[PDB]
């Protein structure tokens, strides 16, 4: 891939399906986690749980055709399940609507509105560099790998963006 020149170094994790969740590891209370969150109607929302101690994705949740409140409900549940993992949320949409609903549901988040190509490239370039270094590990799932393999800046990229938002927190 032109953007992800380090695709061969991506670590491919075994996982168990649990509905909309791909689960690599259950919550370890001795580890700290964050979540990268992208929001979609028939477009997908994707929430990626990163173990900040290992640098590996512990869980990835993906859904479409779910109502706005159900999406936010799933995000709240996933955060809570991994120790109220803080959420790096793409809050860019109509007004402050996304942030309002996250604040109203008590979700622990940091806003990172992907409002321009500069912000998108900042996130994707970081993911790509970590991947080159062998530091990105994701569930070995066809849908995830296809989005990464077929990624172009200008054909869904919601998984890519969610992963990039999570890995923005990893040194
Ligand atoms: Zn290859
Ligand atoms: Zn809670
Ligand atoms: Zn999409
Ligand atoms: Zn998206």
Residue numbers in the entry: 257 to 296, 298 to 411, 426 to 442
Extract from the study:
The large terminase protein is a key component of the DNA packaging machinery in tailed bacteriophages and evolutionarily related herpes viruses. Typically, in addition to an ATPase domain which powers DNA translocation, the large terminase contains a nuclease domain which cuts concatemeric DNA, generated by rolling circle replication. The overall structure adopts the RNase-H fold.
A bound Zn2+ ion from the crystallization solution enabled the structure to be determined by SAD. This metal ion is coordinated by the side chains of D294 and D429 and four water molecules in the canonical octahedral geometry. A similar coordination is observed for Zn2+, although there is also a second Zn2+ ion bound at an additional satellite site, at a distance of 4.6 Å from the site A Zn2+ ion. Superposition of the G20c nuclease structure containing two Zn2+ ions (Crystal form 1) with SPP1 G2P and HCMV UL89 nucleases containing two bound Mn2+ ions shows that while one Zn2+ ion is bound at site A, the second Zn2+ ion is bound on the opposite side of site B. This Zn2+ ion is in a tetrahedral coordination with D429, H427, D300 and a solvent molecule. In our structure, complexed with two Zn2+ ions, the Zn2+ ion bound at catalytic site A adopts an octahedral geometry, resembling the canonical coordination of Mg2+ that would support catalysis. However, the second Zn2+ bound at an adjacent binding site, not previously reported for the RNase H-like endonucleases, is coordinated by catalytically important residues D429 and H427. Binding of this second Zn2+ ion perturbs charge distribution in the active site and may affect DNA and metal B binding as well as water nucleophile formation and coordination.
